Design a protein around this ligand. Structure first.
Ligand SMILES: Nc1ncnc2c1ncn2[C@@H]1O[C@H](COP(=O)(O)OP(=O)(O)NP(=O)(O)O)[C@@H](O)[C@H]1O
Ligand SMILES: Nc1ncnc2c1ncn2[C@@H]1O[C@H](COP(=O)(O)OP(=O)(O)NP(=O)(O)O)[C@@H](O)[C@H]1O
Lengths: 176, 290, 630, 93, 630
């Protein structure tokens, strides 16, 4: 009966995660943008980890149906997933310690949706739209790189040295 | 095998008789007799086993209550003795024979190996030939001693007991020699590397130098004697080899202790030498004038 | 059933363990180190009637000792695959015929493939078998027993055909049967007699009945006209007149007795299921914290205390009251014994597990599988983006929680009821909401108190998770008693525990969080009991020698020994565990080991010891008091 | 080089000289435990200096090194660099 | 060995000459049996100047092999320019054949030593004599290699600094046109023996191609790892028909079709695992035959129980099932009391394996690969047929520290016995002693060519030449040249020495083999042993429990019985019902293990030896209990 419920759980987790993450189209013009470089690296890492998790969940669902036999790695994976433990094979970006799997896959879905949105924006309007998009730093695998990229973009635009730039924060409740 | 061939020929010959002759219960007796001989042909094969010896034939004679003579025994006497009924006794005796054959061939292996084992020797700086292959020698000795100790537990061990004990003694003596010998080698080699590499060590440690000279002469003579007869058993039978090697081990240990104490005294006199290795410190003190 | 379908005649009530072994052999096995169970007796029979050599899967390790004691007359010797001198020992055993036991077959060497397959090559009288380079002579007496301490192993199909398996592994049904037999022996010994007498209407009693005929016929033809010495030979003929009729009565009363033992054993079955569940929860405790390791001897000692050394059973003769008291004391003593060696965070977790076990085992209550499934995996339910509405007074997180809780059928009207409730906010901002949770779930029938408790638990999880633990405590109080958790909220009474519940060979492991020392408790106890105690600090190679000398003195003289800060010496602790396994300590001997909670302590030592977890009392006040005292 | 490490420790104690272990975490468990025991003995011998009752007119401090009583000079010291990810061995914490 | 000219061969030798004119190191890759080695050898030997040296690389090959080859064939000469290595024969270009460039093992740091050595030779035109520590230059030395693709398990990719110099060609399989041409030539040669069937050469050749291609399209490596096809199977087909036809003075067309179908079944239907695949092959053989041989009546030409054997009559002609059954039963009863005293039941699925093993023993270069469940007869049927056919059985005895030189010496001894002394040998190898794959690539040269160059190098060559000429004189042929004597020795090794590999199905993932190399599958004839069916269990049960008195004259047959054996005698008697129940035990246990696998539990392999042990225990227990009661 544990596999009867694990089948439904893994099916729901597969349904939640998007099937693919389109890779960004590198060109000569957009590579000069630090923002495009950061988002390309993020999309690469996210797509790789996405394929990893999707393959693992597909194998788990196949095992629960009897199609696939329980290998040692697979058996360890069922042991972790049934208990709600996050497998070591899934953690490749910094996350809270002791997190269950549902929170991890929900954060996964949010991150991949953000990556899809920014990739579509890049493909449609080029790298120029990467400045006007509102990026959730929580949804990035390394937001420090995003902060550095914003600093570099401001330096390139206004021709100032990077040392001479300092950060300020404005919290705006007004829409638009 | 030839007996089975002949019996099969006889049975096929019997099968060709006219049907009028066959309905009789007397043909039947002869056919049953040949069938029984075919059935006990397995035990006949097992009785030609080389495991059986005079003792096992005596055991068969006693248990089956038959006074056979091994040279004069014929196939018919074994045949007419009820081997079919008495198969349990035959199986027990041949089982005992198999066990004793196993132990006997193990002792044969010991005897052949240790009568054919030669101590390998490799030249060392054109001064003598030191023994090589200590790991193999000690592994073989350990294997044989453990195997004899395990053989002492075997249910069939009483027959070979005395012989086993003899080999046990020899095996232990062999270990009791070479466990010493490697030591008497190693220290000497070590001391040699210290007492001829540096020519100034003679002036620092004259008494230890003289003792090592008198020890090296004796060890070289012993190694020459071994080189003239590198067999393990020939070496073991050298007159007073064990006591001589124990004396050499004791004296080499004493000289190594004296050298270690002298080097430790030199280190404590100038404490920074504690950062310097043994060979480097020996180089430093020996080259005091260079 | 298939044999019955084919009209093949077979005994109806067959006992495998009785049909395949005489009582003398079973007595001999029990004289050896055989745990007397149905599974263990069947396994012991499998070690007697084997054609192929056996593979003994024994995580406990009892079966290796059983094989060793059985074959001691044949001079069996121990070996393992991992040992360097394994192949030569195997060669000697095969060559000379002594039996052998080989351990750690998880790393199965393939050189043993023909030996298990019996691939004898016959040449004259020399019967060779290949092993490595050599061709060695198979002695007739040779027998090998493969062993596995690991019960989680996947052997190759090559080895399975070459070996017959014998599983000495505790499972749910094995422990259930053991516990049920123990209860029937302890509380209804008449049914135990009528059960052992039902498996003695097989070979035992009839064998004795005709073994008496043997002595009769011995003393029947010893006659020369002196049969009528007094015409009182009938006594010898009357001793057989009784037993026959007796063993003719029981054969006639073999359906009434069978039905009676069935009816009486089903009564005591929920206790057995609770026992199995409790023990397997204690086994499950490993993956919560590395220290939470408890042997099966722990649970069986708990059960011996609960059945035989239970002061609450004194003066009670009705069997139903005794059963109820036994169940309650089982839960209570299990919780006390386990939680005395647990960190304070995990006490509520284990209490919740025991409460769930009782809820499974309690009569008249539904399992509440769906509600507990939502309690443990409610977050696993999916909320579509934008599907969460806004509710007056609830934050976003409480809104997601209520939306998830609305999936269950009882809480379907939860959102509307929450909106309509005027007094909701005062409950939501209350300091102790769990005591006054509002009634919001819809019920087709009035719910039991535990149903109300679990529904309140779900509501508190949804709205005020910060109080969840407190609510959880109430659930335990609703299921296992108000004073159930209270005994842990008290000072540790090491006196009675060490005097009664600790054997001399079981070391008392006092583990503390780092920076806290608990040797003062042992010193206070030694002062209270008026018992000489020798305390040694393990911090150097000398301390090992001092500890060995002190333990060798105290084990004979029955003194008390304390070893301070033993976590600094893991390997020496393994050596001490191996030493302790072999001793025959005096009754008054006790060995305390004080350590800090680290993962480098051996797992076996924790498994083979009484664990007591000490933590400082939280608070600034106690911290300042400790600092000033120090 | 372990086989000189006892000799090096005795040299540091006798002459007066510092010793710094760069990335002491990287020593394997056996190596870590043995060196930890040696440094623990040396540190206890050094800490014996600090007590006020011990008058240093006649105070031959000693430590057990290589099964001998080696005199420890006060100028000597030992340092242990570490790389987190982690903690110091329990002997020397 | 001179390749039949086909389109691929002419293309590849044209490219070979083009890339040898520049002295570039050619390399050829492709699937096993594609024909790269033969094309390379034929193209190289067609050139007048080229002197071919055939070196075969293995996992343990090093620069030492190439240096030894240079010392053998080449020599160092001092010149004013410098030290120059040159072939001893003036005006001849020495070309080294490296048959498996990929196979040498990489170091711990992912570099093949010999590949780097060859790289420095081809790129710098020389190397450093280490003994003299001086530079030397190659003058007329070349390299030309063959490979399998790096995806195969035993292979490795080559260094990119090395692959730059070598141009790599891919020799795929010939395809339908090339196969039709090649085997048209072969079958026109083969039918010259019987002059009435020449007209049926071309129709046959298409069939041998067509069915083969159909198999190549229907069965792939994905379904099973050993479903590999290549022209080696076609040459085995040609060889089988040739050996069938060689002693025959004449045939009709229908007998030729029957031999063709028999070889089809024995080469393709044996390797298959699933029963329905075997049915498909059964139908497709008939379809292809009736398509390419119209107006030939199927009933006479090909009856389903097709069997060919040589024991009944001196000629290799078809025989009936019953006569072969009786002969094999008599010889097996002889075998009981001759070499091994264990009963061996003949059932319908073991006589076929006896015939298959005998057939592969009669062919030249006949090597068998028996793959199947553990037990089931392999290593017992191979020994049995080897005893029947008089082949002295040789089995390798791998020790620890059993270096490749020891395997080399064992191969030398068996080769000397098989070739010089003309003593047929069945070289049995088992997965237990084939744990290391490093030595199993030395065997591939033997399986493909019958001679392994480099074995007898040195004085061993002189001794083997002496013994070889002695053997040739014994056979009546007077030979002088060493090359001709070596060729005759190779032919004798082809005729005499056979190899019988025994493996389990692809569950050996942990082993270094994993799935063993497809070259090994291609070189041998594969035979799927499988697991005993219901009929096999029934028959092996009846002939083991026939000595028991399981007879009941009053056995009331049930109105409706459950049956595992659909062909049970009806109405069944007591013995029949008991044996059917004994098979029910095995079937229910298999079902139970499958169910346990379904629920995720740890399963254990169930093999025929379980059934044999069950029947033995049943017999012993029946005898014991009946003796006790009597
Ligand atoms: N054109 C051809 N003419 C005749 N036989 C051929 C031809 N092409 C392939 N074969 C057969 O194909 C089989 C394979 O021959 P071979 O050259 O040894 O393959 P291989 O690829 O070298 N084996 P390997 O070296 O392990 O990869 C043999 O039975 C050949 O007779
Ligand atoms: N047809 C048969 N009838 C009766 N006994 C058989 C039969 N075939 C095999 N056996 C017995 O089965 C046992 C194992 O047979 P065997 O085929 O040698 O195992 P195996 O296949 O070699 N296992 P492995 O070598 O690891 O692949 C032996 O005791 C054989 O005598």
């Amino acid at each position: 009966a544990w596999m009867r419920t694990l089948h439904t759980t893994a099916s729901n987790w597969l349904h939640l995660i998007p099937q693919t993450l389109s890779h960004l189209k590198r060109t000569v013009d957009n590579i000069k943008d630090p923002l495009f470089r950061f988002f390309e690296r993020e999309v690469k890492m996210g797509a790789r980890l996405l394929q990893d998790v999707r393959q693992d969940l597909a194998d788990v669902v196949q095992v629960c149906e009897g199609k696939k036999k329980q290998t040692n790695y697979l058996r360890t994976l069922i042991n972790e997933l049934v208990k709600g433990i996050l497998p070591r094979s899934w953690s490749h970006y910094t996350v809270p310690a002791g997190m269950t799997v549902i929170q991890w896959v929900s954060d996964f879905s949010e991150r991949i949706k953000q990556l899809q949105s920014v990739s579509q924006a890049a493909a449609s309007g080029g790298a120029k739209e990467l400045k006007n998009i509102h990026v959730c730093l929580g949804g990035l695998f390394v937001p420090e790189a995003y902060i550095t990229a914003t600093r570099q973009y401001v330096a390139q635009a206004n021709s100032w040295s990077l040392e001479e730039l300092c950060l300020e924060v404005i919290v705006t409740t007004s829409q638009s | 095998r030839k007996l089975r061939q002949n019996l099969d020929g006889l049975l096929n010959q019997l099968k060709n008789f006219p049907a009028r002759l066959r309905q009789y219960a007397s043909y039947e007796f002869v056919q049953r007799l040949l069938k029984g001989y075919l059935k006990i042909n397995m035990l006949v094969i097992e009785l030609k086993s080389e495991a059986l010896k005079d003792r096992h034939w005596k055991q068969l004679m006693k248990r089956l209550h038959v006074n056979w003579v091994v040279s004069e025994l014929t196939l018919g006497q074994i045949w007419d003795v009820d081997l079919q009924k008495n198969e349990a006794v035959v199986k027990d005796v041949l089982l005992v024979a198999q066990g004793e054959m196993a132990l006997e061939e193990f002792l044969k292996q010991i005897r052949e190996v240790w009568n054919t084992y030669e101590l390998d020797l490799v030249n060392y700086q054109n001064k003598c030939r030191l023994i090589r292959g200590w790991d193999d020698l000690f592994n073989k000795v350990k294997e044989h001693i453990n195997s004899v100790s395990a053989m002492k537990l075997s249910p069939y061990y009483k027959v070979f007991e005395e012989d086993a004990l003899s080999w046990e003694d020899k095996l232990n003596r062999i270990m009791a020699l070479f466990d010493v010998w490697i030591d008497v080698q190693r220290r000497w080699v070590y001391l040699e590397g210290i007492f001829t590499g540096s020519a100034d060590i003679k002036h620092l440690l004259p008494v230890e130098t003289q003792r090592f000279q008198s020890i090296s002469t004796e060890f070289l003579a012993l190694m020459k004697k071994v080189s003239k007869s590198p067999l393990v058993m020939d070496v073991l039978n050298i007159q007073g080899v064990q006591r001589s090697l124990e004396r050499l081990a004791d004296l080499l240990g004493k000289i190594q202790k004296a050298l270690g104490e002298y080097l430790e005294r030199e280190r404590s006199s100038f404490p920074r030498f504690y950062f310097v290795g043994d060979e480097d410190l020996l180089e430093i003190i020996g080259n005091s004038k260079n | 059933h298939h044999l019955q379908q084919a009209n093949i005649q077979f005994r109806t009530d067959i006992a495998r363990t009785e049909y395949l072994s005489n009582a003398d052999e079973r007595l001999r096995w029990q004289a050896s180190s055989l745990p007397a169970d149905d599974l263990c007796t069947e396994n012991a029979i499998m070690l007697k009637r084997f054609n192929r050599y056996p593979l003994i899967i024994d995580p406990s390790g009892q079966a290796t000792e059983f094989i060793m004691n059985e074959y001691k007359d044949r001079k069996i010797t121990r070996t393992s695959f991992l040992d360097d001198a394994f192949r030569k020992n195997l060669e000697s055993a095969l060559r000379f015929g002594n039996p052998l036991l080989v351990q750690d077959v998880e790393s199965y060497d393939p050189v043993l493939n023909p030996v298990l397959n019996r691939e004898v090559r016959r040449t004259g009288g020399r019967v060779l078998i290949t092993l490595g380079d050599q061709d060695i002579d198979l002695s007739p007496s040779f027998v090998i027993f493969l062993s596995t301490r690991d019960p989680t192993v996947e052997f190759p199909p090559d080895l399975c055909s070459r070996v017959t398996f014998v599983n000495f592994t505790v499972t749910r049904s094995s422990l259930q049967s053991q516990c049920l037999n123990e209860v029937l022996k302890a509380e209804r010994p008449d049914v135990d007699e009528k059960r052992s007498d039902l498996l003695k209407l097989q070979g035992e009693f009839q064998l004795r009945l005709r073994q008496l005929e043997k002595s009769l016929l011995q003393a029947l033809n010893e006659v020369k006209g002196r049969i009528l010495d007094d015409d009182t030979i009938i006594t010898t003929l009357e001793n057989l007149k009784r037993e026959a009729a007796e063993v003719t009565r029981k054969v006639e009363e073999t359906d009434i007795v069978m039905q009676e033992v069935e009816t009486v054993s089903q009564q005591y079955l929920p206790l057995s299921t609770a026992c199995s569940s409790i023990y397997f929860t204690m086994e499950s405790l490993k993956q919560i914290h590395f220290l939470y390791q408890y042997s099966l001897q722990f649970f069986l000692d708990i059960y011996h205390n609960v059945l035989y050394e239970n002061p609450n059973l004194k003066g009670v003769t009705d069997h139903t009251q005794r059963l109820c008291i036994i169940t309650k004391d089982l839960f209570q003593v299990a919780f006390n014994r386990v939680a005395r060696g647990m960190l304070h965070q995990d006490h509520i977790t284990f209490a919740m597990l025991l409460a769930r076990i009782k809820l499974k085992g309690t009569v008249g209550e539904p399992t509440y599988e769906a509600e507990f499934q939502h309690f443990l995996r409610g977050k696993e339910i999916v909320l579509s983006a934008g599907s969460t509405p806004k509710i007056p007074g609830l934050t976003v997180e409480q809104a997601e929680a209520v939306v998830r809780l609305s999936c269950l059928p009882a809480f379907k009207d939860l959102i509307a009821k929450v909106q309509a409730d005027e007094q909701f906010s005062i409950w939501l901002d209350s300091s102790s909401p769990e005591q006054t949770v509002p009634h919001l779930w819809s019920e087709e029938n009035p719910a039991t108190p535990i149903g109300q408790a679990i529904h309140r638990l779900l509501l508190i999880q949804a709205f005020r998770p910060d109080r969840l633990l407190a609510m959880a405590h109430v659930f335990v109080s609703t299921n296992l008693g108000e004073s159930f958790m209270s005994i842990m909220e008290q000072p540790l009474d090491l006196t009675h525990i060490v005097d009664t519940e600790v054997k001399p060979n079981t070391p008392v492991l006092m583990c503390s969080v780092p920076g806290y020392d608990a040797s003062g408790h042992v010193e206070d106890l030694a002062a209270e009991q008026n018992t000489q105690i020798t305390s040694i600090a393990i911090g150097s190679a000398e301390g090992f020698n001092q500890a060995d000398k002190a333990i060798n003195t105290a084990v004979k003289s029955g003194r008390w020994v304390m070893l301070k800060n033993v976590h600094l010496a893991p390997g020496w602790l393994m050596q001490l565990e191996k030493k302790l396994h072999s001793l025959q300590p005096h009754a008054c001997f006790r060995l305390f080991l004080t350590m800090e909670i680290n993962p480098k302590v051996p797992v076996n030592l924790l498994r083979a010891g009484r664990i007591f977890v000490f933590e400082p009392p939280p608070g600034v006040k106690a911290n300042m008091l400790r600092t000033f005292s120090s | 080089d372990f086989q000189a490490m006892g000799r090096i420790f005795v040299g540091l104690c006798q002459v007066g000289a510092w010793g710094c272990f760069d990335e002491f975490n990287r020593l394997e468990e056996r190596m870590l435990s043995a060196v930890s025991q040696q440094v623990q003995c040396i540190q206890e011998a050094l800490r014996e200096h600090s007590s006020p009752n011990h008058d240093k007119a006649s105070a031959p401090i000693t430590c057990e090194l290589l099964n001998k009583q080696v005199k420890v000079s006060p100028d000597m010291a030992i340092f242990i660099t570490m790389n987190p990810g982690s903690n110091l061995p329990d002997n020397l914490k | 060995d001179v390749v039949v000219p086909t389109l691929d061969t002419v293309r590849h030798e044209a490219l070979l000459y083009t890339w040898l004119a520049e002295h570039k190191p050619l390399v050829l890759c492709g699937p096993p049996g594609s024909g790269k080695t033969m094309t390379l050898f034929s193209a190289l030997r067609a050139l007048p100047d080229m002197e071919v040296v055939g070196l075969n690389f293995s996992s343990a090959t090093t620069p030492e092999l190439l240096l030894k080859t240079f010392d053998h064939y080449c020599e160092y000469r001092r010149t004013p320019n410098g030290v120059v290595l040159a072939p001893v024969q003036l005006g001849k270009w020495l070309v080294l054949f490296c048959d498996e460039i990929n196979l040498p093992d990489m170091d711990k740091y992912g570099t093949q030593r010999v590949i780097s050595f060859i790289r420095q030779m081809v790129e710098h035109g020389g190397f450093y004599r280490t003994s003299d520590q001086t530079w030397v230059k190659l003058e007329r030395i070349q390299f030309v290699g063959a490979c399998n693709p790096p995806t195969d398990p035993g292979r490795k990719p080559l260094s990119h600094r090395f692959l730059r110099h070598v141009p790599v060609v891919y020799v795929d399989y010939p395809g339908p046109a090339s196969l039709t041409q090649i085997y048209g030539t072969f079958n026109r040669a083969m039918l010259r023996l019987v002059p009435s069937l020449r007209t049926y050469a071309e129709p046959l050749t298409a069939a041998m191609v067509e069915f083969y291609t159909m198999s190549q399209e229907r069965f792939t490596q994905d379904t099973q790892p050993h479903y590999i096809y290549s022209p080696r199977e076609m040459t085995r087909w040609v060889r089988g028909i040739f050996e069938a036809l060689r002693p025959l003075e004449t045939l009709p067309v229908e007998g030729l079709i029957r031999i063709w179908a028999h070889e089809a079944l024995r080469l393709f239907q044996d390797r298959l695992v699933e029963d329905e695949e075997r049915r498909w092959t059964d139908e497709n053989i008939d379809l292809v035959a009736l398509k390419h041989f119209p107006n030939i009546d199927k009933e006479k030409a090909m009856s389903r129980p097709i069997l060919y054997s040589n024991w009944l009559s001196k000629d290799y002609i078809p025989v009936d099932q019953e006569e072969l059954r009786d002969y094999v039963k008599a010889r097996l009863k002889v075998f009981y009391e001759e070499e091994l005293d264990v009963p061996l039941v003949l059932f319908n699925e073991v006589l076929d394996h006896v015939l298959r093993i005998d057939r592969i023993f009669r062919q030249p270069q006949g090597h068998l690969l028996l793959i199947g469940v553990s037990g089931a007869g392999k290593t017992t049927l191979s020994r049995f047929v080897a005893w029947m056919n008089g082949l002295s059985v040789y089995q390798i005895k791998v020790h620890r520290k059993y270096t490749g030189e020891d395997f080399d010496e064992d191969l030398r001894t068996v080769l000397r016995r098989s070739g010089c002394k003309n003593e047929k040998i069945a070289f049995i190898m088992d997965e237990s002693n084939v744990l290391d794959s490093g030595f199993l690539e030395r065997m591939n040269t033997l399986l493909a060519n019958g001679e392994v160059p480099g074995l007898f190098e040195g004085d061993e060559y002189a001794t083997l030449m002496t013994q070889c000429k002695e053997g040739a004189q014994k056979e009546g042929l007077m030979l002088d040249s060493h090359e001709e004597l070596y060729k005759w020795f190779t032919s004798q090794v082809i005729r005499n020495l056979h190899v019988v590999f025994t493996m389990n199905p692809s569950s050996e993932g942990l082993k270094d083999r994993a799935a063993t190399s497809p070259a090994l599958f291609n070189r041998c004839v594969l035979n799927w042993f499988g697991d005993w069916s219901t009929e096999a269990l029934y028959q092996v049960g009846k002939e083991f429990t026939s000595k028991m008195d399981l007879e009941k004259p009053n056995y009331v047959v049930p109105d409706y019985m459950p049956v595992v054996y659909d062909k049970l005698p009806q109405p069944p008697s007591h013995r029949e019902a008991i044996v059917n129940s004994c098979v029910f035990v095995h079937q229910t246990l298999h079902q139970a293990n499958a169910r346990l696998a379904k629920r995720g539990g740890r399963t254990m392999a169930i093999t025929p030896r379980h059934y044999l042990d069950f029947i033995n225990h049943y017999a012993n227990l029946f005898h014991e209990k009946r003796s006790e009661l009597e």
